[PDB]
């Protein structure tokens, strides 16, 4: 049924291939049984997650299908050509304009929103999840192998991206979704405007000091410093950072194409 083409990447969850639908363009991913710690309803939570989020047309990456085997399982997925991560695509271009950076970062939001609307929390935003498709200008968030079910009360686990979680994880192994999903929304937004994360180590973490090593405009400092809040409750919520003045006049993902790529 699918043209497996060559390897796109690997960890130790799994492998990611290019692909042909037999005509779409795919990706195959094929994560191992005994590396799979949270299971749904019996899946790999991804497949829970991705079946809920889903749904309709978003910013997210659509699972098209999937498959069981002894063991493994293999995700097949949504694959834009051209694409790019924004991983990548900072480390190619350097810190971002802020017009770029405001773009890129409201259509996370929308992603975000998105999966939250859906009973979906992603735990792992950062540059390296999201996908450009550079047609379009369109951003899709990856990889929702560390996701969970939403909920109002306290996560006790994590298996995200360590130098993107908040403080109260380091300090006492508890968070709340959403004020934790806004933390790692300002680790990326100031690694958009910056071009590399403001924290590499847990006490800088702790100590939640924003230093900026590249010209930022003082919205944007502002808009940075309030998700990057110590305190989880003096985070922004989602309507607050995109009614924050630095959200504002967001340009279309295609003109977004048309200017910046
Ligand atoms: O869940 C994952 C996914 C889904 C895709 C859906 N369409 C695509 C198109 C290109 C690449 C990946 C995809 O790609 C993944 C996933 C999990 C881990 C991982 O290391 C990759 C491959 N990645 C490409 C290289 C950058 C680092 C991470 C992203």
């Keep these: 049924q699918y043209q ?29 049984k005994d590396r799979i710690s949270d299971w749904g309803e019996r899946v790999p939570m991804e497949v829970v997650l991705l079946k809920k989020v889903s749904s309709g ?12 085997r002894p063991d493994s399982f ?14 990548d695509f900072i480390t190619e271009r350097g810190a971002l304009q802020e017009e770029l950076a405001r773009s890129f970062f409201w259509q996370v939001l929308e992603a975000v929103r998105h ?19 550079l047609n379009r200008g369109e951003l899709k968030l990856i990889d929702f192998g560390s996701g969970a079910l939403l909920k109002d009360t306290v996560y006790t686990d994590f298996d995200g991206t360590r130098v993107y979680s908040p403080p109260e994880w380091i300090r006492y192994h508890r968070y709340h979704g959403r004020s934790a999903a806004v933390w790692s929304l300002g680790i990326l937004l100031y690694d958009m405007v910056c071009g590399d994360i403001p924290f590499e180590h847990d006490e800088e973490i702790i100590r939640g000091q924003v230093f900026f090593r590249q010209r930022v405009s003082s919205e ?3 808009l940075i410093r309030w998700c990057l809040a110590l305190r989880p409750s003096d985070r922004p919520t989602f309507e607050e950072i995109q009614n924050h003045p630095w959200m504002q006049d967001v ?10 790529l």
């Design 115 to 133: 999966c939250h609307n859906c009973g979906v929390l992603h735990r792992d935003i950062k540059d390296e999840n999201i996908l450009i498709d």
């Design 57 to 68: 047309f978003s910013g997210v990456i659509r699972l098209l299908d999937w498959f069981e």
């Design 251 to 260: 340009l279309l993902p295609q003109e977004t194409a048309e200017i910046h």
């Design 220 to 222: 944007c400092q502002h």
């Design 74 to 87: 293999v995700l097949i997925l949504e694959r834009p050509e051209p694409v790019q991560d924004l991983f």
């Design 4 to 32: 497996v083409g060559p390897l796109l990447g690997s960890g130790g969850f799994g492998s990611v291939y290019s692909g042909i639908r037999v005509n779409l363009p795919v990706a195959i991913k094929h994560v191992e």
